Amino acid sequence: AVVTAAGLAWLRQYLNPMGPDTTSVTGYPDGSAVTTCIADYSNTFNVSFPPREALYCTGSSSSEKPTLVDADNYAKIDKWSNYDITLCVLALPMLRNVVMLRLYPHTPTAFALTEQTPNFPQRFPNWSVYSADGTRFNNGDEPGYLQSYVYLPNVDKHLSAARGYRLLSRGITGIFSAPALETQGFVTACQYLAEGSIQSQSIKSDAVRSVTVNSDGTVKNVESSSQTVSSMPRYVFPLDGDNCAPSSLTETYHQAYQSKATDGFYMPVLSSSRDNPFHPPQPRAIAVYGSFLARGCLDPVSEAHEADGPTHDIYRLNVADDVAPLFNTGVVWFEGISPKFSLKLKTRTVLQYIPTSGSVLANFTRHEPTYDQIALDAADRLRNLMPHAYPAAYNDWGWLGDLLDSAISMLPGVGTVYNIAKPLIKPAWNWLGNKVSDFFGNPVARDG
Amino acid sequence: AVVTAAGLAWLRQYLNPMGPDTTSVTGYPDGSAVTTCIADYSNTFNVSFPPREALYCTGSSSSEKPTLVDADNYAKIDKWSNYDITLCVLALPMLRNVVMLRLYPHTPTAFALTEQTPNFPQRFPNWSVYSADGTRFNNGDEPGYLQSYVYLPNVDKHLSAARGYRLLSRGITGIFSAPALETQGFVTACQYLAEGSIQSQSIKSDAVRSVTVNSDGTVKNVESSSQTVSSMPRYVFPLDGDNCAPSSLTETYHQAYQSKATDGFYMPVLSSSRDNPFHPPQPRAIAVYGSFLARGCLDPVSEAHEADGPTHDIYRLNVADDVAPLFNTGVVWFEGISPKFSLKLKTRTVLQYIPTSGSVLANFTRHEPTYDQIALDAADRLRNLMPHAYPAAYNDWGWLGDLLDSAISMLPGVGTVYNIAKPLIKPAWNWLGNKVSDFFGNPVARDG
Amino acid sequence: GYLQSYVYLPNVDKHLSAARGYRLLSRGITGIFSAPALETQGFVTACQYLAEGSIQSQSIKSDAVRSVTVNSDGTVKNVESSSQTVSSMPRYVFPLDGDNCAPS
């Protein structure tokens, strides 16, 4: 009838993963009655304009031979560094490979993805180049953008030795800095559910064509093996790359966060469901849904045109991982950024494990099978009205917890004891104009 | 002014490491304000009379060539198995190598140690033979006893990746079993502080003696390099091997535990100090102090006899480890044991770490900088009146905690709120005669 | 690779020479930072921790003499192995974790 302490702690760490008060770590309040070990991974990365030494090509040049550095095509990327640039970060719900960084000479119209599988995608300190025409980059082409994955190795090590897992919370902080008189730029951030699933794309086989012209050998096996079959199963994400441009995200989602570049960002990615069950680690190749070209059976056609129906393009990422289901995909854009910028990415990922017998995690187990329906219902309440992101320095929200959680905890059903906690009003998160008001109307003076 | 919950939990896990209620794991109550990860290692070993396949020689035979099995000198050890035997376990404060097991044909007069460094000391499943004359054993000698070390590998792995460590508690349980009509034997256990330190023994160099007889070569360098220098530094333990016989331990220490063999033992080893600071992992070669032979400058002598003064023998164990300082050394003896016995050794070692950045421990940290002076003062109170060991089945002591800890918590200073908790009387731990009374006079009926 | 220097107090040496005993009462270090305008970027981190040093001597090795006397009457052949392990000069050693002294 009242929210417990463990439920409140879980709610605070779920909504504010990188808050200063979040020191203790608590599990999901479902009373699973299983031996669990909760792991907290805090990582920091300093991303700036990469040098030539950490830049590789994804084209067919690096097909069999391993990663190849740029053959001093770095002059074009220096030309990029002449003017302002754009920096996209894309946080898919993958456990390792927490975010994908991408660098553009200028803001693109869409989050494009190469149709051919890239060769040797690079972890964060190294980058991989992609051409301007939306294809993989070989030496001598025109570079279009740079891409890298921010990888957590300890997550991989611990996921190997676990019966099951579930993501408890994840937050990404974007401390931005630039030289004086070069602080111009804008930051946008948005979360939305891209519910991926295990799917296989439709591919075609090859028909054999043998013409035996021998006097006794005249088989002439002209059989048509060119039928339509299913490819290897992959975990495909329905992220709308064509609608991932910053302006579309701002005008589509009301909780999207916009501010000046110097404010940075702080995205506490949120789950889209109220139940968070354990899952066995099942890494798979990740892919992203594209769009279809041939209408196929979308119009009255014949049998032969059934096969080439609305088959959506699947973009292989050449990255294997197991994803946290029902968790939002985040995307932030830094537009018009000075090329000599500096972004301190600080990611906190807290997730629960069921240890395997004889594994390392078995030495850190913790028996807290606490249960709290009120906390879960409050999270389901709050999911639809929290902002998608906050300024990087906006931690330790006063309204959270003793007011916001308390105010939202008595709507669920009528399971309420205290008559009235506090009236709740619609906040206005206008960081660009310095007219920010919280959920209770109290103003937010700038703390940074 | 009152003991907190965390302090009580730490006290209970420190005094009763293997109690059934000790499920949660808690750190030292000093408020260190450091990121810590507490690791609990529970290990079980089934020790019986070893077969010939797991028996190696420590003599000069296995000097360069690795461990050598016994060349069917196992007939003498079978002759040992004809009659009753003795089994000593020695728990030094070493973190890994939790205990040292030793098997004797009959009870020795002292805990002897070989003067020459043994070759390839063996972890528990294997044993190493030592001769009857207190020397290392080669094939064809007379076996005197068997020795092995019980090794914890996970402790080594976690100690590698740590800035600092401290031992929180350690308990050793000795579940004893034997065939029916072969349950005869006695068990003795005793703890005492053997405060080791980094010391180097006094050794001698070799003087060069060159006689050049050539017509032009007549140097004759007769210089005396045979001076007294210091050897390699080693962590030396002042354990009194000559006074480690069971009878001497029983008649020396009042809290020493004695019972029938079938009762087993349960030794919660205790610290000898009230402060338990963090220490960096600094593994070193372990050695044990012996006794001196030449009196040297203990009598009026000349300069030349200064060197051969009271130089105590140092027995190298050929084992490297880092020890937990200020923790008691435990020793248990099973005398007159049937050779076809079976001992289930169950060791629980809980210790705190400061994780190194990027290490495995960093994924299991837990921020509980709790402070409790009352708990530490109560431990300092209780150290001198708890029994050194209990019967193997004597867990979940009723008197502990809500009575014993409460009764002892109001002596420290006068920082007392409750007027009187419970009067405290002198217990009588007579397990041999079944006349056991606890700290409050309540009798202890046999639960096993 | 890098530059290193020690900040030395001579009066402390002079006064420590003429003293039976000493003890440190307190010590503070202030770091007033300045830079040209539009060049103020950077971060500062500070941490204290106990590195309890002690007088220790490292383990070193001696050199074994190898003399081959080939003379008709001189055939000593002192091949004695002086290459044993001994202790070096005692030094005050600090257990500061250099590998874990990175700012992060």
SS (H, E, C) chain B: CCCCHHHHHHHHHHHCCCCCCCCCCCCCCECCCCCEEEEEEEEEEEECCCCHHHEEECCHHHCCCCCCECCCCHHHHHHHHHCCEEEEEEECCECCCCEEEEEECCCCCCCCCCCCCCCCCCECCCEEEEECCCCECCCCCCEEEEEEEECCHHHHHHHHCEEEEEEEEEEEEEEEECCCCCCCCEEEEEEECCCCEEECCEEECCCCCCCCCCCCCCCCCCCCCCCEEECCCEEEECCCHHHCCHHHHHHHCCCCEEEEHHHCCEEEECECCCCCCCECCCCEEEEEECCCCCCHHHCCCCHHHCCCCCCCCEEEEEEEECECCCECEEEEEEEEECCCCEEEEEEEEEEEEEECCCCCHHHHCECCCCECHHHHHHHHHHCCCCCCCECCCCCCCCCCCCCHHHHHCCCCCCCCCCCCCCCCCCCECCCCCCCCECCCCCECCCCC
* CB neighbour list of residue B299: distance below 8 Å, 6 or more residues apart: none
Separation between Cα atoms, residue A100 and residue A102, nearest integer Å: 7
Separation between Cα atoms, residue A156 and residue A321, nearest integer Å: 9
How distant is the alpha carbon of residue B237 from its chain centre? Answer: 10
The residue assigned the tokens 């001196």 is B292
Which of the residues B32, B214, B220, B235 would you substitute to probe the C interface, choosing the one with the greatest number of C C-beta atoms within 10 Å? B214
And the tokens for A121? 């995608």
Separation between Cα atoms, residue C59 and residue C86, nearest integer Å: 6
B364/A154 touch (CB, cutoff 8 Å), yes or no? no
Rounded to whole angstroms, what are the CA distances from A138 to A75, A105, A129, A420?
A: 15, 18, 8, 65
Separation between Cα atoms, residue B316 and residue B312, nearest integer Å: 13
User: Nearest C-alpha of chain B: how many angstroms from A365?
Assistant: 9
CB < 8 Å to A179, chain C: 38-39, 41
Separation between Cα atoms, residue B239 and residue B195, nearest integer Å: 8
A179/C37 touch (CB, cutoff 8 Å), yes or no? no
And the tokens for B192? 């005492």
Q: How was this structure determined?
A: cryo-EM
A180/C104 touch (CB, cutoff 8 Å), yes or no? no
* Among B154, B363, B367, beta carbon nearest to A41: B363
Residue A181 has a CB neighbour count (10 Å cut-off) of 9
Separation between Cα atoms, residue B400 and residue B396, nearest integer Å: 8
Resolution of the experimental structure, in angstroms:
3.1
B360/A24 touch (CB, cutoff 8 Å), yes or no? no
And the tokens for A263? 């404010």
| β-pairing verdict for A234-237 and A284-289 | parallel
- What SS3 state is found at A62? helix
* CB neighbour list of residue A191: distance below 8 Å, 6 or more residues apart: A253, A255, A267, A269, A270, A328, A329, A330, A331, A388, A389
Residues of A with CB under 8 A from a CB of B: 23-25, 37, 39-41, 154, 157-158, 360-361, 363-364, 366-367
Using only the alpha carbons of chain A, give its radius of gyration. Answer: 25
Element (H, E) at A55: strand A55-57
C78/B213 touch (CB, cutoff 8 Å), yes or no? no
* CB neighbour list of residue A135: distance below 8 Å, 6 or more residues apart: A59, A114, A115, A116, A141
Separation between Cα atoms, residue A147 and residue C23, nearest integer Å: 58
Q: Look at residues A103, A125, A391 and name the one whose alpha carbon lies nearest to residue A268.
A: A391
Separation between Cα atoms, residue A267 and residue C49, nearest integer Å: 33
Residues of B with CB under 8 A from a CB of C: 163, 198, 200, 203, 205-206, 208-214, 217, 225, 229-233, 277, 280, 282, 356-357
Separation between Cα atoms, residue B46 and residue A261, nearest integer Å: 64
Separation between Cα atoms, residue B327 and residue B329, nearest integer Å: 7
Element (H, E) at A82: helix A74-82
Q: Look at residues B391, B353, B360 and name the one whose alpha carbon lies nearest to residue B260.
A: B391
Using only the alpha carbons of chain B, give its radius of gyration. Answer: 25
Angle CA B215–B216–B220, to nearest 5: 90
One-character DSSP codes across A190-211: EEE----EEE--EEE-------
| Long-range CB contacts for residues C60-69, cutoff 8 Å, separation at least 24 | C60/C85, C60/C86, C60/C87, C60/C88, C61/C85, C61/C86, C62/B205, C62/C86, C65/B208, C67/B208, C67/B210, C69/B210, C69/B211, C69/B212, C69/B213
Element (H, E) at A11: helix A5-15
A367/B41 touch (CB, cutoff 8 Å), yes or no? no
Separation between Cα atoms, residue A309 and residue A290, nearest integer Å: 15
* CB neighbour list of residue B162: distance below 8 Å, 6 or more residues apart: B281, B353, B354, B355, B356, B359, B361
For helices B373-382 and B5-15, the axis angle rounded to 10 degrees is 30
One-character DSSP codes across A218-256: ----------EEE---EEEE---GGG-SHHHHHHH-TT-
Angle CA A325–A326–A329, to nearest 5: 95
Residue B255 has a CB neighbour count (10 Å cut-off) of 15
CB < 8 Å to C80, chain B: 206, 208
Residues of B with CB under 8 A from a CB of A: 23-25, 37, 39-41, 154, 158, 358, 360, 362-368
Angle CA A274–A280–A284, to nearest 5: 100
Torsion of CA B275, B288, B249, B267, to 10 degrees: 50
Is the C-alpha dihedral spanning A397, A400, A403, A407 positive or negative? positive
List residues in chain A that are followed by a break over 2.5 Å (C to N).
Answer: none
Beta bridge partners of B437: B428, B443
CB < 8 Å to B360, chain A: 154, 157-158, 360
Cβ proximity of B448 and B390 under 8 Å: no
The residue assigned the tokens 């180097």 is B200
And the tokens for A48? 């700036």
Cβ proximity of B138 and B84 under 8 Å: no
Element (H, E) at A174: strand A162-177
Rounded to whole angstroms, what are the CA distances from C17 to C11, C12, C20, C54?
A: 10, 9, 9, 22
Cβ proximity of B287 and B237 under 8 Å: yes
Taking CA–CA distances from A367, the nearest residue in chain B reads B24
Q: Look at residues A291, A312, A345, A305 and name the one whose alpha carbon lies nearest to residue A148.
A: A345
And the tokens for A171? 């937050």
And the tokens for B381? 């109170």
* CB neighbour list of residue C70: distance below 8 Å, 6 or more residues apart: none
